[PDB]
Amino acid sequence: APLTITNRCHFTVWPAVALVLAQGGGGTELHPGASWSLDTPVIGSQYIWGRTGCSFDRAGKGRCQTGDCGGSSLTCGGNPAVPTTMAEVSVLQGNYTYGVTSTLKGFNVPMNLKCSSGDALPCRKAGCDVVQPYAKSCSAAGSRLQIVFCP
């Protein structure tokens, strides 16, 4: 509420959110079963992807096994390492559109993008998007976006 990223894999994933035109981004560590509640901007679009096999020290430098974006400092920008599953979310004041690919940058983690007002958009193996825009629209006053890993 309003954006939620959930990890349904049996392994830890490291979600990363970066806006399309910005040098860097943010994220968290998600243990199996854990979710990340996020607040959404009035405007703009964001890339959302998961990273696996991240090992960091107390500072901490380190790299992720898949979907690594400049290590700890999530600067790329918007270009994590192949392979990685790429989810895109655009926002208008209130309205959401959500799209995903597993062809452009490969496939690492299966995804499911869904809205409480919209229809489900699955991406469970590589090649889920036949052609872009592989996206659905969501349009409510109090709607709720969900990204699931390993749905």
Ligand code: NA
């Ligand atoms: Na990080």
